[PDB]
Write a protein that binds this DNA or RNA. Sequence first.
RNA 1: GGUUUAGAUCUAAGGACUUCCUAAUUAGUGGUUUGUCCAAUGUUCGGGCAUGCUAGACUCUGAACCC
Length: 683
Amino acid sequence: KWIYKFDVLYQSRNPRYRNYEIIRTNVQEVLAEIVSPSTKNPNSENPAVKKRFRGIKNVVSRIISNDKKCRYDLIYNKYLSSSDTRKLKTMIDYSTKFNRVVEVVLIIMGKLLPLDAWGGTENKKVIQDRIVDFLRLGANERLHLDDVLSGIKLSKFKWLGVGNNISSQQDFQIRKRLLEGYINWVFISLVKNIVRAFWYVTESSNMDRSKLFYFTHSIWNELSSNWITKYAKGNLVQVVSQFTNGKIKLIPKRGGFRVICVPLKQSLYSFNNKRNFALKQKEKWDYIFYQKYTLSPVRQVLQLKLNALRKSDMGHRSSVNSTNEVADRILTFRNDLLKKNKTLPVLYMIKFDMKECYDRLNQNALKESIAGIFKEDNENTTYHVREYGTLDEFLKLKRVRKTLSISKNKIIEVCHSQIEDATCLVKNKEGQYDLFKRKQGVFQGFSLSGIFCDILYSTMVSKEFKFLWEATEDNLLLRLVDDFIFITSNKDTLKKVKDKISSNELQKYGAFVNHEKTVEINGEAGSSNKMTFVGLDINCLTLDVKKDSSQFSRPTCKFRSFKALFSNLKQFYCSNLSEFLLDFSSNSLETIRENVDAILKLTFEAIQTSFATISKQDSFERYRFMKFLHVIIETTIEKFARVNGSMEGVEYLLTCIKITITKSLAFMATKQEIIEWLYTLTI
RNA sequence: GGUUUAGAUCUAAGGACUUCCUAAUUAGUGGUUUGUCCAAUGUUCGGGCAUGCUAGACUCUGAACCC
Ligand SMILES: [K+]
Ligand SMILES: [K+]
Ligand SMILES: [K+]
Ligand SMILES: [K+]
């Protein structure tokens, strides 16, 4: 939990490698960072460590001198500036190859540190093996400093000593303390600075978030500018000079970019003039208060009533919350028609989706939409919601195993302020960011923008697809918000719904149908039967479903007994339990339950396979599998709450895990004791 | 029969706290007393892992592997 990778991410800059040097500090400045990282003025330290100040001062000046004479210009051109105007297929093909970036990182590192600074040649390869490890680190993935030091022989650092071998115990304690400071300074101050100097590293919005992509600044600045000037024409406005400001962040896609705008806490000018650590502290703590007590309550009340709008109102019934609820509804529709027919008629189906649903959202229709769910109520009314708090605010007892209110007369005010005043900061060619508001839509990344689309399209479905609920036993649709699917039994109702999507009537709400991905399938015995909806392989005749079988790979179980099996699953359960998946703002609360079970299920059916293999050799103990479950369950609910910061539905998620594992233990009859233990989990 | 090795103790050498004296500032050097300290420190549900463990002794207790 010492070396984090997010420090390197998203650091864009236009470099000039003619006069360039990575170390920005001096020999006396790095010295304090090595001997006493907590506080400066190493003269306060003990007299025995000053005895070795000369050696620590000597080696740093040598790598600095090498840094000053390091011809970065020749390195860039030789290894990572062979680009050509090829117009490659997909954005991630422009990235520097991972073998190349580690090569450039190491050869710069190699010419920076002499083997004295590496601690011999046998330690140099060890440190290099951890430098490539840090490069393989995912976006959120961290690295423990003790792991980095495992294998590095301290005795070989004679410049870290007085010049002789380790004499006493006290000499060992301080030499190790000095080694930690140095090695940590190597990665934080040099390694992270090396990658930051040459590559804009991004998060590769497609799957396997542990993969980071290294884009050369020259390449990236050309790629983003081209894409952002096309986006600016339709979506952005140059505006004149907080809580409605964010920094734009376009992440790669299949030949495109997904424009995310991560909100910014600092004010309009406290971001520019960052040289005051008195104002930014007073403003970054305004944002945390703005969310918990003013921005979270408005979001909580919106959803809490849309759940009653989705059930009661027929129009919002077509709106879905999770990917699995679409499968159930068609399977209930499958069984609903078999009440009287019992021989399913020829079915007709269509699928379509909206282009840039967030970026095209009609702001004027949005304000009317939110007013629609408050139209029935009064205006000077106050809704109530419960407080959740952070996982740090659970200090009743460590090692985990009330109300709040806001007036709806103000919640409608803060909604409009997020639709109107939302403005991003794109970096100009000069290098200084500019302010841009939105012509249409709302930024992807703003908290309220999530539910803003969910409520609009639910209103949209209600106000437009009124024909399709007359004799709903024949046909019914599901939203799954950015997609759409419709199932019918007669051509009469299919011809009427196809007209509306192919007409401009739907783009009043700001929803433009993507006709390029609009598929039609009929069970006419020769047209088609197989079709794939979002995560559902829906058959036009039997309505069977198997979702991917693919999205999370096999654990490739080979391990022996007893607890070597468990260890591999633990480390490769949290790795598949990325905090991007558990994001409450990005995905739905119900959708998190689905994917957390898929990660859960694959690591329990692989247990049963290799359970009987080593069952003859070793009989498992019914109390070593308990603490395994306790750790797996605890680390899941702790990861889910700490990523969001709130604890919305932590009990909800709790009695989904202990449910999906009580059914994954049907084998091994008389497993009662461990199953009964799963029930008591409440704290 | 062969290989490897531990702790205790003794002696010598060095190291670490603490007062006094160093033409030291990309500097931190060298003598020193009136008490102490020289083996672990991290890490992992008392065993492993990583780093560290001066030099001798026919002083004492031993240990592990192969034939
Ligand atoms: K020493
Ligand atoms: K011996
Ligand atoms: K010995
Ligand atoms: K000994």
